[PDB]
Amino acid sequence: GSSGSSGMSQLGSRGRLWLQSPTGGPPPIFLPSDGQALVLGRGPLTQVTDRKCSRNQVELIADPESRTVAVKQLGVNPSTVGVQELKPGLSGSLSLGDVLYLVNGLYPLTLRWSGPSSG
Numbered sequence: 756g757s758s759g760s761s762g763m764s765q766l767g768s769r770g771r772l773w774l775q776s777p778t779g780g781p782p783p784i785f786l787p788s789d790g791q792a793l794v795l796g797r798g799p800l801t802q803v804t805d806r807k808c809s810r811n812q813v814e815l816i817a818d819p820e821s822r823t824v825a826v827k828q829l830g831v832n833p834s835t836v837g838v839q840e841l842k843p844g845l846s847g848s849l850s851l852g853d854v855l856y857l858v859n860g861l862y863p864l865t866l867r868w869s870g871p872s873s874g
Contacts, residue, residue, distance in 0.1 A: 768874060772817040772824065774855075775865040776801070783867070786817030786824065793817070795857060795864065796830065807832050807858045813841075815855070815864075824849040824866055832858040 772786045781802045786793050796812040797803050809830035816825040827846040828834050835856040836847040849855055854863040 768870060770819075770869040770871075772819055772822070773867050773869065774815075775867040777863075777865075786815060788817055788819055790816065790818075792825075792827075794829070795855075801857060801862055801864065803857055803862050805859065805862070808862070809858075812857055813855070815849075822851050822868055824853075826855060830858070834858060835860055 773783045775783060792814045794811045794814050795801055796810045797805065797808040798810060809832065812830035812832065813834050814827040814829055818824055825846065826836050826849055828841045828843055831843060834841040836849055837853045841847055849866050851866055851868050853866050856863050
């Protein structure tokens with residue numbers, strides 16, 4: 756038959772925000788574009804099972820507005836947003852490529868953005 760519905764439309768190439776993990780790590784999680792906050796910490800999320808990590812260690816938010824990500828510490832352990840240490844109740848930003856050491860300056864989460872070629 757004829758499916759139809761819609762025709763065509765495209766402004767730019769656009770993309771999607773996500774986090775990149777090193778070998779022996781979890782898959783590429785796609786942050787919520789809606790603007791929600793993806794709390795990272797212990798669990799299958801990042802495969803982190805360190806007590807030092809808290810279910811809600813920090814709050815990541817995908818900001819496709821300017822290809823950025825907001826980070827807010829809701830845990831106790833001091834998190835590092837790149838090369839700067841955070842605090843409890845503090846908040847910072849992460850750029851495309853920047854790292855986000857969940858805790859113990861370990862379990863770094865590289866911020867990546869999807870972008871296809873050709874077109």
